[PDB]
């Protein structure tokens, strides 16, 4: 590139205006690359209290027109995140609007751990257990976070 892309101008803007909860921490491997970074979420309440979850962000040249690409790198038992790391956050796909920011996404991500959404989940089993048996879900979360099996599926430990 000759000058700064429209995407680079915007991302610089958004990244500089983050008002994150204490449970979230953002990091850049390269201070010069604002298009790739990690977000770490360590809930301090809700079903996932004491856990540590890492998400990767990849901002494309189509940003803010195109929403950035986000994935969970921490295996977790959750209605809205599948074993592959895909994250079902409305504003990340069909509800994205150029007016939203990284700060917008981050708050969306952290809300998933405070109020998992059984509606349109990526892990239906996890969803069912959430509506059907509130507490069994709570136990599954605990076990899976410590590292353990649920059904024939093994969830790696992810406590902070």
């Amino acid at each position: 590139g000759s000058m700064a892309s429209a995407a680079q101008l915007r991302i610089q803007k958004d990244i500089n205006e983050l008002n994150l909860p204490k449970t979230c921490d953002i990091s850049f491997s390269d201070p010069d690359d604002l298009l790739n970074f990690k977000l770490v979420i360590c809930p301090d309440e809700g079903f996932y209290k004491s856990g540590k979850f890492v998400f990767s962000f990849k901002v494309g040249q189509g940003y803010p027109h195109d929403p950035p690409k986000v994935k969970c790198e921490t295996m977790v038992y959750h209605p809205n995140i599948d074993l592959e790391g895909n994250v079902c956050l409305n504003i990340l796909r069909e509800d994205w609007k150029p007016v939203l920011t990284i700060n917008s996404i981050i708050y969306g991500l952290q809300y998933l751990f405070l109020e998992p959404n059984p509606e349109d989940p990526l892990n239906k089993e996890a969803a069912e257990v959430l509506q059907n048996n509130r507490r069994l879900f709570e136990q599954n979360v605990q076990r899976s976070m410590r590292g353990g099996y649920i059904g024939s599926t093994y969830f790696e430990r992810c406590l902070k």
Binding site: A4, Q12, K13, I15, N16, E17, S27, P31, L34
Partner: protein, 92 residues
């Protein structure tokens, strides 16, 4: 078009950040400054994010041209004060 800013080549970063922080025609809260060096983006300084501020602090203390920073080159500055990122045409 970029607001023409004039500093002497010897100036330090702290200097430019201070102009932006105290100008009555500007005075931005906590500005993030970047620029394109050798076809790539170089983040000069940003305080809001510690991961970044920690590795860009030495620059405030560095000389302006020791930053490979050469003139006529548009600076990209973003701050709460700016609705959109604004470009500053540096002046030698």
């Amino acid at each position: 078009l970029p607001q023409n800013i004039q500093f002497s080549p010897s100036a330090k970063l702290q200097e430019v950040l201070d102009y932006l922080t105290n100008s009555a025609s500007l005075q931005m809260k906590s500005p993030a400054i970047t620029a394109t060096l050798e076809g790539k983006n170089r983040t000069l300084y940003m305080q809001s994010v510690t991961s970044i501020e920690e590795r860009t602090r030495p620059n405030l203390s560095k000389t302006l041209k020791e930053l490979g920073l050469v003139d006529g080159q548009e600076l990209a500055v973003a701050d709460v004060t700016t609705p959109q990122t604004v470009l500053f045409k540096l002046h030698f």
